[PDB]
Structure 1
Amino acid sequence: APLVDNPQIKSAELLRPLPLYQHAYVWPYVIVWPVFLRVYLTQELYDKYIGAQEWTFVWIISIVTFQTLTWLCTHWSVNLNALFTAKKASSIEDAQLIKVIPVANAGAADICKLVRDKVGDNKTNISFLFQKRRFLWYPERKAFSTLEFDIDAEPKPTLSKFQLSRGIESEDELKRLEQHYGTNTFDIPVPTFTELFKEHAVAPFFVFQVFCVGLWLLDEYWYYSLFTLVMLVVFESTVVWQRQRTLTEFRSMSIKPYPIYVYRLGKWTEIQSDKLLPGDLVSVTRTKEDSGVACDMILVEGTAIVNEAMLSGESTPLLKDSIQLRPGDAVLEVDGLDKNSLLWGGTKVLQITHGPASGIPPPPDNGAMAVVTKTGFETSQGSLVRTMIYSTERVSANNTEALLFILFLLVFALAASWYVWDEGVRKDRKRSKLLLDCILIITSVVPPELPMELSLAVNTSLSALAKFAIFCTEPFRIPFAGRIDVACFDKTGTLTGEDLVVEGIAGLGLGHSGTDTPKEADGAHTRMVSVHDAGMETTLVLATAHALVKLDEGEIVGDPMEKATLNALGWVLGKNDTLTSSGILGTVQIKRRFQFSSALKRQSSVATITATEVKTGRKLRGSFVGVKGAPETIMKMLVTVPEHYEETYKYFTRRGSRVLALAYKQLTTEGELGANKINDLKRESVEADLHFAGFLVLQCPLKEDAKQAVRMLNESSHRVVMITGDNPLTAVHVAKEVEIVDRDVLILDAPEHSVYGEESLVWRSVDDKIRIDVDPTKPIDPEILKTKDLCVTGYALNKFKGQVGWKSLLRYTWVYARVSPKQKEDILLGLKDMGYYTLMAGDGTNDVGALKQAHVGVALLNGTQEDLNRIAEHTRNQKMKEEPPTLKLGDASVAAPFTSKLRNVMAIPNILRQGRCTLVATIQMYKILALNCLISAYSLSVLYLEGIKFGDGQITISGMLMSVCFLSISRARSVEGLSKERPQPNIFNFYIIGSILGQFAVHVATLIYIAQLCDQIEPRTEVIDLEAEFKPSLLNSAVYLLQLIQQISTFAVNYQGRPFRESLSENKGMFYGIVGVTAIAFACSTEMLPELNEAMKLVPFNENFKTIMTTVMIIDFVACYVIEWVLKKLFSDLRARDIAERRPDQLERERVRKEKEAREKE
């Protein structure tokens, strides 16, 4: 049995701490250090080693580096921390620390300290905080587990327990609950500069840089090494300062407490929302701005209209109901028949209404009585916050490819050092000079400037991305954007505005036929009449059927959809229960209202009307009855059903747009009905016979940029999928409009008629004429999986979990509808565990688990360019002196590596358009560096053993050329428009290694040939000494010219231009230097300028040698290009993966569109 009983935790272990005396980085180094110290200090018989300054410095550095590595091993890994710092314990009575390991993809390893509480006389509590969860020890089960509440037990509690709950009394029980469950607080840490710098300073690359810099302190230079260390410290300080600033700008979040009424100790008291305990009786009222319900509550009395904007994703108000109507002694199941009564935390209560089981007096603020069940970090949004903060480690550019690259270079470095040391010991030279030379060889091959170059090449991309208002917190995730195989998308807020807008009034032509209405095959009217131009009866119904309440000051409370209808209609209500005055020019006062019941679906009202139409001059007045409802219920009350009633609303509701039916009745044609007769009117008399007005269609309006951005993503080698939380029909229609899916579509769900307790999954069509049944064993491959597309809903994902068909449902599906916040993370993890890199672009809180676990996660805020301009104006004005609404810095930008600020779907291609421009650079800085470094190894391994030396001017020219060409490579800007070809993803591949080895072999062969020819023409039989000054000779000129041509060629051939980044002819800083240096080299080779040869201490040349040298340089330059070209054409992987393989018809349509737009572009 596992020690920790939780699905997330893999394994645990009990530990006992040790003091500083017994640590593994103190104990071996306190008995070894004095032994060497005595020998160095007061032995005077140094026969073990000679005793020179460098010989003792080597022994100092070895022990210091061993101490540093032994200390850092406890910080790099936690298993070594458990092995070194602590020891294995026996049981709970002696353990003080515990080590917890999470599952493979749900966080990071940790060591947590145990806390013991002595609230009981003979009872104690053992708890440790892992990932801000209060794990507790239960002695009966001999295992740790999470806290348990009243609502969660293997016997489900009866309804009488919550119905008869009278709050919390008996103050000692209150103290027990407070000490056992804790306060309702979140307390996000927001780490400061010191811990960030400590975390940054123990990275392997910084330690490697510090060690490589400190190795140069071998008495050669005491002023050229401290300056580099100071520069490194300054750079690492400013990088972490920028990260801290851009992290505190966004991740700084807070939940403001608000006072509430609590029925504590049999009395209603004012209590801050920070201190709430399970079992408390809470009166819930209308919520304030930017503040949701503080805790998970279940209603007991009254009805509330809430806005589930953080679980469903939509903003359409719901109708929560109490549990008074349910009888006692009933099981409280949550999945069905009572999920309409649970009130989750973090949501906003739009309205509260009452339209005494426990004998409790009503609260003074006149809210709804409810019982809080779960509080703290165990609520529904507590898990969301936990997935925000601790879910995934930073990347920090310390991947295994860099380690393999460094080892691959270090192999050649060690080989060269071994060769040099063998020659030195054979020639019996001084050991100190040999150690100096070997240290130079070791630190010159493996590059100590690679992290600096990578950081510069990523920070320039950050500065380029900052122009389009995209701000990023983790800079080293930009290279991940180059290789993207699937792009996930949300539906509400990302591709479509979240608010519901009135499309207009439809079906006004029903009944009488004008013989010009555009119909369909099934005879459904499709005319869309704007709400601005409408008849008298329909606008009076639209202005009278609403349910709006005016307060004392004048604020209007209700569903915002009737506000958006009224302000478009131009009407306005006064302080009294009246509606005042487009083109209607009238007034109406209402008398009696009915209520939405969720069983009858009928909002009806009576009123007295007077309207004066202006276009025709007709006038109406008297009494009026307006009814708004669902079309099926309204249809029965019509006395004359029109000719095409059951087709128009069906066609409109199969498109995903919400539809409502409007009916009017004229009770008395002149004057009101009369006093007190409206009061006795019954629901079955008011809603008896009515007259049709029209269908009011509401929909979420599509953005103007979604189609173009999705088209540009699809026409590339990417693939676009949609993971929404809306209805299947609306998601299917939006996907069809945006061209995510263009074929016949089949959805996977339960039958559309509401069946509860039935597990039958059936394939359905949008037209609803195909009902192929299926069972969770295997989907049929040849027809359903191949001919028609798919749409898997969230009700079929948890029924397909673990089966063999699951691996087939993550490959042939493009949209997912009605998806819970956990299932989005599940889908993205399943896609990531197949080999595809992913990207998610969300807007809200319900997709945090998807934003965090995606490789590149963008969060789109809502704000136009004019708002940013006004914010800039306000900031400039307040800075000059030393007001506009701020951006909705919500919850998606907290958990996303990137954050847009412009509310555009085109911000997703642009990031991709930058990612390629980074990745293509990041590859070649690996290829250009290593090859150069490899050449340097040879140029210091067997060529240094020769008598060749270079003058100061030549060295300065080579260094300036190398520095300029290396600084020009990193700075790169993108090229507009995505391309069908994909860059090379990974550094370790047959193409890169083959090209590097081939070019290095060509360089080595050319150098060997020219050295043997130069020795052949004029032999040098004199002895060779390695400490002499520079001497001009023909070898010293030939080797230098060839080496300079090699340094030119490595930058000349290894450069990828037009399809991803800047062309070479546009990059002035590299091109001018390359052409100038190669012109200088060729001019010196062909002896055009006699003065130029003596300018750089270059000897005169024989006529026969000049031609063969020029030909060998030309052969080198040609072969270095030919080998790379043939390897790129043969053994390279740039094509699309199996998930993005477009069908031929789609490519044909793309070609037709391209040629048509090119033809009309003239």
Structure 2
Amino acid sequence: GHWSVHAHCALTCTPEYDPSKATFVKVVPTPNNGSTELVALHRNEGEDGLEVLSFEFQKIKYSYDALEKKQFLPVAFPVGNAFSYYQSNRGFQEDSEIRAAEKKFGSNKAEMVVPDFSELFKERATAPFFVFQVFCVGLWCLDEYWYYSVFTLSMLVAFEASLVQQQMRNMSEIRKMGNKPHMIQVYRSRKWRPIASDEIVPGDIVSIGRSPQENLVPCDVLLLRGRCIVDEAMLTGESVPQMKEPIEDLSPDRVLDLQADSRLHVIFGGTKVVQHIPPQKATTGLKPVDSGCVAYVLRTGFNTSQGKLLRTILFGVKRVTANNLETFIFILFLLVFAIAAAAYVWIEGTKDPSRNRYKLFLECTLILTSVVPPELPIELSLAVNTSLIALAKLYMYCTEPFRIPFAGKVEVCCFDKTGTLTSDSLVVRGVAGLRDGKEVTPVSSIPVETHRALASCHSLMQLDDGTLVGDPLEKAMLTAVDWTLTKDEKVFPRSIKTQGLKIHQRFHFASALKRMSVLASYEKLGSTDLCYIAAVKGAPETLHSMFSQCPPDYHHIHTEISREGARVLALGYKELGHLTHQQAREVKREALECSLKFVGFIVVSCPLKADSKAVIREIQNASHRVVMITGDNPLTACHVAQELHFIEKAHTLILQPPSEKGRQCEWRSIDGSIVLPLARGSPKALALEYALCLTGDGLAHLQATDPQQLLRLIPHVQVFARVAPKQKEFVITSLKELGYVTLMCGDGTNDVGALKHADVGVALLANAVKLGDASIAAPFTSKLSSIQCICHVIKQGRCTLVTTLQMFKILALNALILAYSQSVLYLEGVKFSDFQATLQGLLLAGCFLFISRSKPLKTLSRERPLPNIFNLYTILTVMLQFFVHFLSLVYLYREAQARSPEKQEQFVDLYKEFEPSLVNSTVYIMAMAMQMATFAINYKGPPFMESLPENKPLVWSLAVSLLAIIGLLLGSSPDFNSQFGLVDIPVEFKLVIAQVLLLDFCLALLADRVLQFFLG
């Protein structure tokens, strides 16, 4: 197709080589991603007299640097600007350069336009099945069946339009899940105007902050002033919130680099801001009305990190064809047998010179159309649509309906720790260090000193409504304390008879200091004097030295708590004696750290959802493999995997990159007991001995060093930590290339890159709706935060895959039987009247529609489904059933012929009208028995899908077919078989026909079940 695309461009305009004035430029796709396309260069008047050549491919603008590089280059950004420039920046002052920068940098627009319905229909027309159907329809048009052909073509195009409409209403859900652009308070023309997110352009100054609507940050912005709490779990995967500092404090001599200074100074897009700390009024500078953090827009549009990943998916890869190689080779096999039967008909007809040639050719071509049914794609589409409707009842959507059958063949399942397995809400297990040993004591039994240390030291604030907002760590910290936090900064006990504490000065976290200090005073009991006590909390390793008295087991308890992976944070409290009112202002906020007293630790971990463990166990009992791919700290990921029984080995070892170049990588255990360098051999023995986990840094080092060892190692790794969004995609592609079908369940925008490439990708919604970005590029989307959707999808996919295998088997056998019967007996002059053929067609269509609507069982099983129709079992059973049925059909035909009156014509008149006989009636009875036996036999029942009796429409269809066969065999009503145009047969002959029918049925069932038992 792509090679065909450039032919049209060449026809339209001739290629140009001279760079003076080029009408169009061909785009090189590169083998990794992209597609071949043509873009038109844009001529712009130069204010300085210099013209710039530019083009837009995949919403990326490039430029041709005639001055220095003499080649096409992407548009330069303020990424490389000096760090001192932003200190004196006042923002955009005139609208002329605002428009200019909007032109030469782009716009912050991320909104989809859904692909056109006409374009979707044209793309659907490229399916070879539709072309084959049109060929067949025109072929019956040639066969003088013009009205029937027109009706069939109309039905086919109507159903295709219905399929496209279903895909479109699915696409509507994705469009709704797109982030609706939101108003932003922005500075322009020396004034603050409210401005929508789409029209933001780089270079402006924007005052961001915590919004009441819990909206995401619009674009990558540079924090000029103010401090804020950001939760980049959606975008970076780090569950722990991180601090952000203003740039006004730093020296101007530095040069800003995104790689080095990403974590502490640039706020990314798509993340959620939690708390905003307005700057002091003493500092003179940008003054916001909303009192949010004023900041500088670095990047916009799809050039932001979230934009990069999103776009690189959006125009990255094609939708995988619903016409796989399996169906192609199945059609090839059916057509091979079709051509064999056609050649037999042609040869024997040409053996008769009296008969015309064009008429026989038309008859043979009609046979070739009849052998390959027009419902071959229609029936599969019906089964898939029924599965999708059944799945939609579980509050889950499917934007790519054809990938449901792929769910059965999944062998490895991947999960994201944060947002999918671990809930956002965090609860405190207890307050550690207040009792002997490593045991943590509940909040009930901790002393009152710990109560006041926990309550006083917090950065939370109160709104007009009074709702508590802030760091979830501090949220649970205050919830366990349960003391009410008033708007007057007074902390009052709900159930304790203690005087409240009023905070005078609060100093927030400093990344340089790794400590956060709170100064407050309490009224002494029985007196009006104010006693000032400050409780400071922060990094335990740094805060250790500030303790005047420290227990000997401080480091030991800290290490043991850290091994558990829960966020450990030391609590401090100093007596400080008595302080005056003026001295409280005089004493600096950073001066309280000296001469501290240890009070204990607080342990906080993310609790798993209740049903996560059951789902993981159920998946593991289905001969499946489960792997964790998350970006949190490796210790926390290993602990969470251990709790969910991802890993059952006694110990698990970390793999780390070497600090010194040329040093072989060596595993270290979490406990550090076992250390062993990597061996060049297979990791099978190490995996058997203990669980294996790989970090992102180690993955990058191995990728740079040797891909081969990484590809061997990846299949046996249980936990992936500190993995980048591109590294997720690399891991998933590595698993997929080995042949394993990959399934992943993630919600953050980290998982999008890998979800797009996953065979069956499921996106979740944490804390269940904003309907986040990951659902846009995920084939499947669920509105339930739980992971039970994975189990439901696996069950549905197993049922659909088994149904598709059964459909292929039944279609193949029926097509072979019908093709041979027509080819040999129309040549023999044995044809049914139109009424019985119509009954055959309607019964077949009904029974297929009934089998396509199967229901799945509630519980999955250990047995694995057949990976594909291309196995020895399917071909062998289809062929063997064909022979066992063929022998019976030939026996019945010979039995009927030996007694029929001897033929009066050596040749056969092909257009002689129907006449009732013994032979035609016997053939019709045998064909109906054929259909009955096939639909009874090829229903692979439990444990994979509902039992045969449960499918009530199918039971009724087979029962009515059997009743019709029995009635025709008995012929109780002469009017009945008179209407069917079948002469009565003597009972003596009824005996033999019934005996051979029962023998054929029993032989087919026995052989099929024996083969299933042997090659199960």
Task: Please give the TM-score of this superposition, normalised by the length of structure 2.
Answer: 0.90
Question: Any conservation in 1 of the 2:461–2:469 contact (CA below 8 Å)?
Answer: yes
Q: Would you say 1:850 and 2:754 are equivalent positions?
A: yes
Q: What pairs with 1:605-754 in structure 2 (closer than 5 Å)?
A: 605-609=518-522, 622-642=531-551, 644-668=553-577, 673-681=579-587, 686-750=592-656
Give the drift of 1:1068.
2.9
Amino acid at match of 1:576: D
Q: Provide the residue aligned with 1:535 in structure 2.
A: 447
Give the drift of 1:582.
4.0
Question: Any conservation in 2 of the 1:287–1:293 contact (CA below 8 Å)?
Answer: no
Q: What pairs with 1:149-298 in structure 2 (closer than 5 Å)?
A: 149-152=77-80, 158-163=82-87, 167=91, 176-191=100-115, 193-218=117-142, 220-252=144-176, 253-262=178-187, 267=190, 270=193, 272=195, 273-280=197-204, 284-286=208-210, 289-298=213-222
Q: Provide the residue aligned with 1:144 in structure 2.
A: 72
- 571-580 vs 777-786, greater mean Cα deviation: 777-786
Relative to structure 1, the CA distance from residue 597 to residue 941 in structure 2 (aligned partners, 3 Å threshold; closer, same or farther) is same
Structure 1 residue matching 2:948: 3-state secondary structure:
coil
Give the drift of 1:412.
3.0
Give the drift of 1:1042.
2.1
Deviations 1:46-79 (A, max 9, x none): xxxxxxxxxxxxxxxxxxxxxxxxxxxx799646
Q: What is the aligned counterpart of 2:849 among 967, 974, 997?
A: 967
Structure 2 residue matching 1:635: 3-state secondary structure:
helix
Question: Any conservation in 2 of the 1:863–1:901 contact (CA below 8 Å)?
Answer: no
Counterparts of 2:964 and 2:120, CA distance in 1: 49
Q: Would you say 1:592 and 2:474 are equivalent positions?
A: no
Q: Would you say 1:811 and 2:715 are equivalent positions?
A: yes
Q: Would you say 1:800 and 2:702 are equivalent positions?
A: yes
Relative to structure 1, the CA distance from residue 890 to residue 759 in structure 2 (aligned partners, 3 Å threshold; closer, same or farther) is farther
Q: Provide the residue aligned with 1:909 in structure 2.
A: 791
Q: Provide the residue aligned with 1:888 in structure 2.
A: 770
Q: Provide the residue aligned with 1:824 in structure 2.
A: 728
Q: What is the aligned counterpart of 1:508 among 429, 434, 438?
A: 434
Counterparts of 1:923 and 1:322, CA distance in 2: 62
Amino acid at match of 2:726: K
Counterparts of 1:971 and 1:76, CA distance in 2: 42
Amino acid at match of 2:648: D
Give the drift of 1:1013.
4.2
Question: Any conservation in 1 of the 2:612–2:787 contact (CA below 8 Å)?
Answer: yes
Deviations 1:826-861 (A, max 9, x none): 111111111100001111222111211111111122
Counterparts of 2:681 and 2:253, CA distance in 1: 43
Counterparts of 2:368 and 2:342, CA distance in 1: 7
Q: Provide the residue aligned with 1:1145 in structure 2.
A: none
Give the drift of 1:898.
1.3
Amino acid at match of 1:203: A
Q: What pairs with 1:109-148 in structure 2 (closer than 5 Å)?
A: 109-120=35-46, 123-139=50-66, 143-148=71-76
Counterparts of 2:987 and 2:475, CA distance in 1: 94
Question: Any conservation in 2 of the 1:116–1:124 contact (CA below 8 Å)?
Answer: no
- Percent of counterpart pairs with the same letter? 45
Give the drift of 1:658.
0.9
Q: Would you say 1:790 and 2:699 are equivalent positions?
A: no
Give RMSD over aligned pairs: 3.7
Relative to structure 1, the CA distance from residue 946 to residue 781 in structure 2 (aligned partners, 3 Å threshold; closer, same or farther) is closer
- 118-127 vs 75-84, greater mean Cα deviation: 75-84
Q: Would you say 1:1037 and 2:965 are equivalent positions?
A: no
Q: Would you say 1:548 and 2:460 are equivalent positions?
A: yes
- 585-594 vs 325-334, greater mean Cα deviation: 325-334
Q: What is the aligned counterpart of 1:457 among 374, 378, 383?
A: 383
- 889-898 vs 714-723, greater mean Cα deviation: 889-898
Structure 2 alignment gaps of length 5 or more? none
Relative to structure 1, the CA distance from residue 138 to residue 988 in structure 2 (aligned partners, 3 Å threshold; closer, same or farther) is farther
Counterparts of 2:506 and 2:766, CA distance in 1: 37
Relative to structure 1, the CA distance from residue 751 to residue 663 in structure 2 (aligned partners, 3 Å threshold; closer, same or farther) is farther
Q: What pairs with 1:61-100 in structure 2 (closer than 5 Å)?
A: 78=5, 89-90=16-17, 92=19, 96-98=23-25, 100=27
Counterparts of 1:86 and 1:751, CA distance in 2: 54
Question: Any conservation in 2 of the 1:296–1:372 contact (CA below 8 Å)?
Answer: yes
Q: What pairs with 1:1055-1134 in structure 2 (closer than 5 Å)?
A: 1055-1078=939-962, 1081=965, 1096-1101=980-985, 1105-1130=989-1014
Give the drift of 1:971.
0.8
Counterparts of 1:202 and 1:114, CA distance in 2: 27
- 722-731 vs 994-1003, greater mean Cα deviation: 994-1003
Q: Would you say 1:833 and 2:731 are equivalent positions?
A: no
Q: Name the count of aligned residue pairs.
A: 1003
Deviations 1:406-446 (A, max 9, x none): 23323333343344344445433345643542342122111
Q: What pairs with 1:936-1015 in structure 2 (closer than 5 Å)?
A: 936-951=818-833, 954-1015=836-897
Give the drift of 1:952.
5.2
Relative to structure 1, the CA distance from residue 768 to residue 175 in structure 2 (aligned partners, 3 Å threshold; closer, same or farther) is same
Relative to structure 1, the CA distance from residue 821 to residue 685 in structure 2 (aligned partners, 3 Å threshold; closer, same or farther) is closer
Counterparts of 1:231 and 1:1095, CA distance in 2: 31
Question: Any conservation in 1 of the 2:220–2:298 contact (CA below 8 Å)?
Answer: yes
Question: Any conservation in 1 of the 2:207–2:288 contact (CA below 8 Å)?
Answer: no
Q: Provide the residue aligned with 2:314 in structure 1.
A: 389
Counterparts of 2:534 and 2:744, CA distance in 1: 49
Q: Provide the residue aligned with 2:514 in structure 1.
A: 601
Amino acid at match of 1:119: E
Amino acid at match of 1:970: S
Amino acid at match of 1:147: V
- 934-943 vs 599-608, greater mean Cα deviation: 599-608
Q: Provide the residue aligned with 1:927 in structure 2.
A: 809
Structure 1 alignment gaps of length 5 or more? 1-73, 511-523, 865-886, 1133-1162
Amino acid at match of 1:1121: L
Counterparts of 2:591 and 2:910, CA distance in 1: 115
Amino acid at match of 2:459: A
Give the drift of 1:261.
4.3
Q: Provide the residue aligned with 1:46 in structure 2.
A: none
Counterparts of 2:979 and 2:210, CA distance in 1: 87
Counterparts of 1:664 and 1:468, CA distance in 2: 52
Relative to structure 1, the CA distance from residue 794 to residue 476 in structure 2 (aligned partners, 3 Å threshold; closer, same or farther) is same
Relative to structure 1, the CA distance from residue 1031 to residue 558 in structure 2 (aligned partners, 3 Å threshold; closer, same or farther) is closer
Q: Would you say 1:574 and 2:486 are equivalent positions?
A: yes
Give the drift of 1:539.
1.4
Give the drift of 1:381.
1.4
Structure 2 residue matching 1:486: 3-state secondary structure:
strand
Counterparts of 2:682 and 2:343, CA distance in 1: 64
Question: Any conservation in 1 of the 2:534–2:573 contact (CA below 8 Å)?
Answer: yes
Amino acid at match of 2:862: K
Question: Any conservation in 2 of the 1:125–1:137 contact (CA below 8 Å)?
Answer: yes
Give the drift of 1:645.
3.2
Q: Provide the residue aligned with 2:354 in structure 1.
A: 428
Q: Would you say 1:499 and 2:381 are equivalent positions?
A: no
Task: Please give the TM-score of this superposition, normalised by the length of structure 1.
Answer: 0.79
Give the drift of 1:1123.
4.2
Relative to structure 1, the CA distance from residue 398 to residue 136 in structure 2 (aligned partners, 3 Å threshold; closer, same or farther) is farther
Counterparts of 1:137 and 1:1004, CA distance in 2: 72
More helix by share: 2
Give the drift of 1:708.
0.7
Structure showing greater relative contact order (alpha-carbon pairs closer than 8 Å, 6 or more residues apart): 2
Counterparts of 1:486 and 1:86, CA distance in 2: 50
Q: Provide the residue aligned with 1:64 in structure 2.
A: none
